[PDB]
Coordinates of C-alpha atoms and ligand atoms in Angstrom, one line a residue:
Chain T
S27 CA -72.6 9.0 6.1
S28 CA -73.4 12.7 5.3
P29 CA -73.8 14.1 1.6
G30 CA -70.0 16.0 2.4
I31 CA -68.6 13.8 3.5
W32 CA -65.2 12.4 1.6
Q33 CA -62.1 10.6 2.6
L34 CA -57.8 11.1 0.6
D35 CA -56.6 7.1 0.5
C36 CA -52.7 7.1 -1.3
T37 CA -52.0 3.9 -2.6
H38 CA -48.4 3.3 -4.3
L39 CA -47.6 1.1 -7.6
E40 CA -44.7 1.5 -10.2
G41 CA -42.9 3.8 -7.1
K42 CA -45.7 6.3 -8.4
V43 CA -47.6 7.3 -6.2
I44 CA -51.8 7.8 -6.7
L45 CA -54.1 9.9 -4.5
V46 CA -57.9 9.1 -4.0
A47 CA -60.4 10.8 -2.6
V48 CA -63.8 8.7 -1.8
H49 CA -67.6 9.6 -1.6
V50 CA -67.7 7.5 2.4
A51 CA -71.8 6.9 1.4
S52 CA -71.5 6.3 -2.9
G53 CA -68.1 4.9 -2.8
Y54 CA -67.5 6.8 -6.1
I55 CA -63.9 8.0 -6.4
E56 CA -61.9 11.0 -7.9
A57 CA -57.6 9.9 -8.1
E58 CA -54.7 11.0 -9.1
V59 CA -50.8 10.2 -9.4
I60 CA -49.1 12.7 -8.5
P61 CA -44.9 12.4 -7.8
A62 CA -44.4 12.0 -4.4
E63 CA -48.2 12.8 -1.7
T64 CA -46.5 16.2 -0.5
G65 CA -48.9 18.8 1.1
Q66 CA -48.5 21.0 -1.9
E67 CA -50.2 18.3 -3.8
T68 CA -52.6 17.2 -1.9
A69 CA -53.7 21.1 -1.0
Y70 CA -54.1 21.2 -5.4
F71 CA -56.2 17.9 -5.6
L72 CA -58.3 18.9 -2.7
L73 CA -59.2 22.5 -4.6
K74 CA -59.8 20.1 -7.6
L75 CA -62.6 18.1 -5.4
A76 CA -64.8 20.5 -3.7
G77 CA -65.0 22.7 -7.1
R78 CA -66.5 19.4 -9.2
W79 CA -68.1 18.1 -5.6
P80 CA -69.8 20.1 -2.2
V81 CA -66.9 18.9 -0.9
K82 CA -68.3 19.2 3.4
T83 CA -65.6 17.5 5.6
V84 CA -62.5 15.3 4.6
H85 CA -60.9 12.6 7.0
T86 CA -57.3 13.5 6.4
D87 CA -55.0 9.9 4.9
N88 CA -52.4 10.3 7.4
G89 CA -51.0 12.5 9.8
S90 CA -48.7 14.8 7.6
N91 CA -51.4 16.3 5.6
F92 CA -53.6 16.6 8.7
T93 CA -51.0 18.3 9.9
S94 CA -49.8 20.2 6.4
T95 CA -50.5 23.8 6.8
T96 CA -50.2 24.2 3.0
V97 CA -52.8 21.4 3.7
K98 CA -55.1 23.5 5.8
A99 CA -54.7 26.4 3.4
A100 CA -56.1 24.8 0.7
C101 CA -59.3 23.8 2.7
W102 CA -59.7 26.5 4.1
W103 CA -59.7 28.5 1.6
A104 CA -62.2 25.7 -0.1
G105 CA -65.0 25.4 2.9
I106 CA -63.7 22.1 4.0
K107 CA -63.7 20.6 7.6
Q108 CA -60.5 18.9 7.6
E109 CA -60.4 16.2 10.0
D110 CA -58.6 13.1 10.9
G111 CA -59.4 9.4 8.8
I112 CA -59.0 7.5 12.1
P113 CA -61.3 4.4 11.9
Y114 CA -62.9 4.6 15.2
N115 CA -65.0 2.0 12.8
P116 CA -62.2 -1.0 11.8
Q117 CA -64.2 -2.3 8.5
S118 CA -63.3 1.2 7.1
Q119 CA -59.4 0.2 6.9
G120 CA -60.7 -3.2 5.4
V121 CA -63.2 -1.3 3.1
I122 CA -60.3 1.3 1.4
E123 CA -58.0 -1.5 1.2
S124 CA -60.6 -3.3 -0.9
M125 CA -60.7 -0.4 -3.3
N126 CA -57.1 0.0 -3.3
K127 CA -56.6 -4.1 -4.5
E128 CA -60.0 -3.4 -7.0
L129 CA -58.4 0.0 -8.7
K130 CA -54.7 -1.7 -8.8
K131 CA -56.6 -5.1 -11.1
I132 CA -58.1 -2.1 -13.1
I133 CA -55.1 -0.8 -14.1
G134 CA -53.2 -4.4 -14.6
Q135 CA -56.4 -4.9 -17.2
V136 CA -55.8 -1.5 -18.7
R137 CA -52.0 -2.1 -19.1
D138 CA -51.8 -2.7 -23.3
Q139 CA -53.3 -0.1 -23.5
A140 CA -52.8 2.9 -21.2
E141 CA -48.3 4.6 -21.9
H142 CA -48.9 6.0 -18.7
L143 CA -50.0 5.4 -16.0
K144 CA -52.1 8.6 -14.9
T145 CA -54.1 7.2 -18.7
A146 CA -54.6 3.6 -16.9
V147 CA -55.6 6.1 -13.6
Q148 CA -58.7 7.9 -14.5
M149 CA -59.3 4.5 -16.9
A150 CA -59.9 2.5 -13.4
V151 CA -62.0 5.8 -12.2
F152 CA -64.2 5.3 -14.9
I153 CA -64.1 1.7 -14.8
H154 CA -65.1 2.2 -11.0
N155 CA -67.7 4.7 -10.6
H156 CA -69.7 3.6 -13.7
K157 CA -69.6 -0.2 -12.4
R158 CA -73.8 -1.4 -11.3
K159 CA -73.4 -3.2 -7.8
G163 CA -80.2 -2.0 -7.4
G164 CA -77.5 -2.5 -9.2
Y165 CA -77.1 1.6 -9.3
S166 CA -73.4 2.8 -9.7
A167 CA -71.2 4.7 -7.6
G168 CA -72.0 8.0 -10.2
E169 CA -75.3 6.8 -9.9
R170 CA -75.6 6.9 -6.2
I171 CA -73.9 9.8 -5.4
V172 CA -76.3 11.8 -7.3
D173 CA -78.5 11.0 -6.4
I174 CA -77.5 10.9 -2.7
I175 CA -77.0 14.9 -2.8
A176 CA -80.0 15.7 -4.9
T177 CA -82.0 14.3 -1.9
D178 CA -79.8 16.5 0.1
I179 CA -80.3 19.8 -1.7
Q180 CA -84.3 18.3 -2.0
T181 CA -84.4 18.2 1.8
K182 CA -82.5 21.7 2.6
Chain G
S27 CA -80.9 20.4 -23.5
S28 CA -80.3 17.0 -22.5
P29 CA -78.2 15.7 -18.8
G30 CA -75.9 14.3 -20.6
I31 CA -74.7 17.3 -23.7
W32 CA -70.7 19.3 -22.5
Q33 CA -68.8 21.2 -24.9
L34 CA -65.2 22.0 -24.7
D35 CA -63.9 25.7 -25.1
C36 CA -60.4 26.7 -25.5
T37 CA -59.7 29.8 -24.3
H38 CA -55.7 31.4 -23.6
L39 CA -53.7 33.5 -20.9
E40 CA -50.7 34.6 -19.7
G41 CA -49.8 32.3 -23.2
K42 CA -51.3 29.6 -21.3
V43 CA -53.8 27.4 -22.9
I44 CA -57.5 26.7 -20.5
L45 CA -59.3 23.8 -21.4
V46 CA -63.2 23.8 -20.9
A47 CA -65.8 21.6 -20.4
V48 CA -69.7 23.3 -19.8
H49 CA -72.3 21.2 -19.0
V50 CA -74.9 22.4 -21.1
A51 CA -77.7 22.5 -19.8
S52 CA -76.2 23.5 -15.7
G53 CA -73.0 26.2 -17.0
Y54 CA -71.0 23.3 -14.4
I55 CA -67.6 23.8 -15.4
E56 CA -64.3 21.1 -15.1
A57 CA -61.2 22.9 -16.1
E58 CA -57.2 22.2 -16.9
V59 CA -54.1 24.6 -18.0
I60 CA -52.3 22.6 -20.2
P61 CA -48.6 23.4 -22.1
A62 CA -50.8 22.9 -25.8
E63 CA -54.2 22.0 -27.3
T64 CA -53.3 18.5 -28.7
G65 CA -55.1 15.3 -29.7
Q66 CA -53.6 14.0 -26.6
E67 CA -54.0 16.6 -23.9
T68 CA -57.9 17.0 -25.3
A69 CA -58.1 12.9 -24.7
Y70 CA -56.7 12.9 -21.5
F71 CA -59.1 15.3 -19.6
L72 CA -62.1 13.7 -21.7
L73 CA -61.8 10.4 -19.8
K74 CA -61.3 12.2 -17.4
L75 CA -65.0 14.2 -17.6
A76 CA -66.3 10.8 -18.6
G77 CA -65.3 8.7 -15.4
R78 CA -66.4 11.5 -13.4
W79 CA -69.9 12.4 -14.4
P80 CA -72.2 10.5 -17.5
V81 CA -70.8 12.4 -20.5
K82 CA -73.0 10.7 -23.5
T83 CA -72.2 14.0 -25.7
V84 CA -69.5 16.4 -26.4
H85 CA -69.6 19.1 -29.4
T86 CA -66.1 19.3 -29.8
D87 CA -64.3 22.4 -29.4
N88 CA -62.5 23.0 -33.1
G89 CA -61.9 20.8 -36.2
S90 CA -58.6 19.5 -34.7
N91 CA -59.6 18.1 -31.8
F92 CA -63.3 16.8 -33.8
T93 CA -60.7 15.1 -36.3
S94 CA -58.4 13.9 -34.2
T95 CA -57.5 10.3 -34.0
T96 CA -56.7 10.9 -30.1
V97 CA -59.6 12.4 -29.2
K98 CA -61.9 10.3 -31.4
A99 CA -60.3 6.7 -29.6
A100 CA -60.8 8.2 -26.6
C101 CA -64.2 9.0 -26.9
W102 CA -64.7 5.5 -28.4
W103 CA -63.1 4.4 -25.0
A104 CA -65.3 6.6 -22.8
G105 CA -68.6 5.9 -24.6
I106 CA -68.7 9.5 -25.7
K107 CA -70.8 10.5 -28.4
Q108 CA -68.3 13.5 -30.2
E109 CA -69.6 16.3 -32.3
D110 CA -69.0 19.8 -33.7
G111 CA -69.5 21.9 -32.0
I112 CA -71.0 24.6 -35.1
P113 CA -73.2 27.0 -33.4
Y114 CA -76.6 26.8 -34.9
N115 CA -78.3 29.0 -32.3
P116 CA -75.5 31.7 -32.9
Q117 CA -76.5 32.8 -29.2
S118 CA -73.6 30.1 -28.4
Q119 CA -71.0 31.8 -29.3
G120 CA -71.8 34.6 -26.8
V121 CA -72.7 32.7 -23.8
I122 CA -68.9 30.8 -23.9
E123 CA -67.1 34.0 -24.3
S124 CA -69.0 35.4 -21.7
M125 CA -68.1 32.7 -19.3
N126 CA -64.5 33.0 -21.4
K127 CA -64.2 36.7 -19.4
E128 CA -66.1 35.9 -16.0
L129 CA -63.2 32.8 -15.5
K130 CA -61.0 35.1 -16.5
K131 CA -61.8 38.5 -14.3
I132 CA -61.7 35.8 -11.4
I133 CA -58.5 34.0 -11.9
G134 CA -57.6 37.9 -12.0
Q135 CA -58.8 38.3 -8.8
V136 CA -57.6 35.6 -6.9
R137 CA -53.6 36.1 -8.5
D138 CA -52.5 38.0 -5.1
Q139 CA -53.7 34.0 -4.2
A140 CA -51.9 31.6 -6.4
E141 CA -48.9 32.1 -7.5
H142 CA -49.7 29.7 -10.5
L143 CA -51.8 29.8 -13.6
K144 CA -53.3 25.9 -12.9
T145 CA -54.3 27.1 -9.2
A146 CA -55.8 30.3 -10.5
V147 CA -58.3 28.6 -12.6
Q148 CA -59.6 25.8 -10.0
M149 CA -60.7 28.5 -7.9
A150 CA -62.1 30.5 -10.6
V151 CA -63.8 26.7 -12.0
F152 CA -65.0 26.7 -7.9
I153 CA -66.4 29.8 -7.8
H154 CA -67.7 29.3 -11.1
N155 CA -69.6 26.4 -9.9
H156 CA -70.5 27.7 -6.3
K157 CA -72.0 30.9 -7.6
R158 CA -75.9 31.6 -7.0
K159 CA -77.6 33.0 -9.8
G160 CA -78.1 35.7 -10.2
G163 CA -84.0 31.5 -4.1
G164 CA -81.5 31.1 -7.6
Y165 CA -79.5 27.7 -7.8
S166 CA -75.7 27.1 -8.3
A167 CA -74.9 25.3 -11.4
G168 CA -73.6 21.9 -9.8
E169 CA -76.4 22.2 -7.5
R170 CA -78.3 22.4 -11.1
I171 CA -76.7 19.8 -12.8
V172 CA -77.0 17.0 -10.0
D173 CA -80.9 17.6 -10.2
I174 CA -80.6 17.7 -13.7
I175 CA -78.2 14.3 -13.4
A176 CA -80.5 12.9 -10.3
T177 CA -84.0 13.6 -12.3
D178 CA -82.6 12.0 -15.8
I179 CA -82.0 9.2 -13.1
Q180 CA -84.9 8.7 -12.1
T181 CA -87.2 9.1 -14.6
Ligands
ICO1 O1 -74.2 6.6 -15.0 C1 -75.2 8.3 -14.1 O2 -75.8 8.5 -13.8 C2 -73.4 8.9 -13.3 C3 -73.8 9.9 -12.7 N1 -72.9 10.5 -12.7 C4 -72.1 9.8 -12.4 C5 -70.0 9.4 -12.8 C6 -69.4 8.6 -13.2 C7 -70.1 7.8 -13.6 C8 -71.1 7.7 -14.0 C9 -72.2 8.6 -13.5
ICO2 O1 -73.7 23.0 -3.6 C1 -74.1 22.3 -4.0 O2 -75.0 21.2 -4.0 C2 -72.9 21.2 -5.2 C3 -73.4 20.7 -6.1 N1 -73.2 19.9 -7.0 C4 -71.3 21.3 -7.0 C5 -70.0 21.6 -7.9 C6 -69.7 22.2 -7.3 C7 -69.8 23.5 -6.2 C8 -71.3 22.4 -5.7 C9 -72.1 21.6 -6.1
CL3 CL1 -44.6 9.7 -1.0
CL4 CL1 -52.9 25.7 -28.3

């Protein structure tokens, strides 16, 4: 549950691919719609995430991205430790599935508003990260976790 | 200089358009390459930014985006107060021009590495936000401390 640990998650809707990075300790997410999940796309997505948050470790979402030389290259470039995403703790499988279900539910709730899926996915990221659960939001928690970490060191 | 204030900045390279949002108090940025600066692109970029950080106010980069119905609609959706970016303090213009020069210099430093401009721009966002200035903190550190301190008050 370190401040630096993120998990990649790839989910499908409307025949399109949604790539999600979840900051494990907070539940905070970033997401994008991509044409298909290739090493190049996943690498570019990781480069963007790591320029925005202090990404120390990524649990990749599958073996092909764990194997990908293009993904390993972006992890090397951005200072990220690439790990597998094996759920040694099986409650992981479950948290990620519930998150994909919540995100898809929010996407359906904004369909009268967003003409393209990529808009609906960013509206879903916005509502996911601002939702109060404290009740703190994921957005609040990730900032508190990383700030507290910067202040301990 | 509040924790919620961002400034839009649009700069040009390779005849392509780079759209930047700067968190004014920290210097932290996010950026994208877009085909042209249209209200729809700026709107979509603001929606993404605001799902990621608690954006309270955005100083728009020009009058067309200030005017744009599409931009105003994304600001309404995301809870953002849209303001002009008139530099009432003239040292603003200078600070933005210098960041555009520094960003372009980093893009040049990575051209042996990135085949597409959009990759070079994300590597630049990365190196910009991680740079220690000039006991010195990075922009990435400052934005987290600023917003965390604001949340705790
Ligand atoms: O409300 C807050 O303090 C937030 C800090 N970072 C965020 C990211 C997404 C949404 C809300 C916040
Ligand atoms: O180094 C840190 O603690 C950072 C916190 N937020 C960031 C965003 C980009 C780069 C570094 C950091
Ligand atoms: Cl795929
Ligand atoms: Cl343009």
